[PDB]
């Protein structure tokens, strides 16, 4: 009865709007082109998209929000799902981001 996320590694390097992740030994691993959450704080996360899966195990991440909050050594959780956004007649007349945030 816990909201258990799926930690897959740590943040190794940051170059502008993209990042690289190093997987912790013996972890489930992340899937290609999936969304991941970088724990910038115990309650705040930054969104990223998986772009590369290298032989070394390192993961290429495209950051989407809260980039300034991302630092090397932070934890990363894997949602394990592709990108889904709100859709419907309830969005008309509104300004939204690609992630669905109004």
């Amino acid at each position: 009865f816990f909201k258990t996320t799926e930690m897959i590694g740590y943040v190794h390097s940051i170059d502008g709007t993209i990042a690289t992740l190093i997987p912790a030994p013996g972890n489930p691993g992340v899937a290609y082109n999936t969304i991941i959450q970088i724990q910038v704080s115990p309650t705040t996360f930054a969104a990223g998209l998986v772009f590369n899966l290298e032989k070394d195990g390192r993961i290429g991440i495209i950051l989407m929000d809260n980039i300034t909050e991302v630092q090397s050594g932070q934890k990363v959780m894997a949602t394990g799902q592709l990108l889904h956004i709100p859709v419907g007649a309830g969005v008309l007349g509104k300004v939204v981001n690609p992630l669905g945030h109004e």
Binding site: P25, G26, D56, G57
Partner: protein, 136 residues
């Protein structure tokens, strides 16, 4: 350097393709850990390597900044007390100039040992100085 015969024989084998408790993706820091695990498995003792890493970590705290780039493990007295497998690996890293991976090869080796011994480690992340209470 005069490595022992057992390590010499193992170093020339395709130990990288052998079976291990876990299937970790190949990496530079993983090759050394696999070599240590394979060497220790023959003797059956794994805690010796862990003690060697503890000594290395303690010794490194006193070494000068950026000691991994002018490093000579043979001349360093702190490493003279290490086991043959660990000492061979350190020389192996120094030859390739990868002594900066000491703190990561150890993590992999511990993971292999825990998997082999059937131990599950739970990391408890706590605030600095808040580790007093861990009952929950």
């Amino acid at each position: 350097y005069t490595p022992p015969e057992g390590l010499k024989k193992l170093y020339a084998s395709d130990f990288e393709n052998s079976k291990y408790p876990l299937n970790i993706v190949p990496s530079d820091s993983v090759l050394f850990a696999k070599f240590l695990y394979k060497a220790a498995e023959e003797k059956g003792n794994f805690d010796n390597i862990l003690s060697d890493f503890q000594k290395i970590a303690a010794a490194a705290s006193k070494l000068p900044i950026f000691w991994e780039r002018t490093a000579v493990v043979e001349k360093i007295p702190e490493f003279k007390q290490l086991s043959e497998p660990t000492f061979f690996t350190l020389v192996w890293m120094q030859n390739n100039g990868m002594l900066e991976l000491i703190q990561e090869v150890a993590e992999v080796y511990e993971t292999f040992v825990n998997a082999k011994q059937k131990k599950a480690v739970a990391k408890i992340f706590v605030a600095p100085g808040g580790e007093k209470n861990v009952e929950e």
